[PDB]
């Protein structure tokens, strides 16, 4: 499928990442997983350029 960035913003919590994925549906599993561990509960922007998926609380 491709690579995806994946960076989290909480109010005392910080992370970006980078993944890659066979095809999107594990993607999108792996990003509720993968940023709920972060501790976030917020709105989510979207960078094509770079797939950056950035999470502000």
Same mark, same amino acid.
């Given at each position: 499928? @491709? *690579?995806? =960035? +994946?960076? +989290? /913003? @909480? =109010? *005392? +919590? =910080?992370? $970006?990442?980078? &993944? $890659? #994925?066979?095809? #999107? #549906? &594990?993607? $999108? ?6 940023? /709920?561990? /972060? @501790?976030?509960?917020? $709105?989510? &922007?979207?960078?094509? #350029? &770079? =797939?950056?998926? *950035?999470? *502000?609380?």
């Amino acid at each position: 499928m @491709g *690579t995806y =960035k +994946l960076i +989290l /913003n @909480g =109010k *005392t +919590l =910080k992370g $970006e990442t980078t &993944t $890659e #994925a066979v095809d #999107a #549906a &594990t993607a $999108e599993k792996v990003f509720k997983q993968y940023a /709920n561990d /972060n @501790g976030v509960d917020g $709105e989510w &922007t979207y960078d094509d #350029a &770079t =797939k950056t998926f *950035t999470v *502000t609380e």
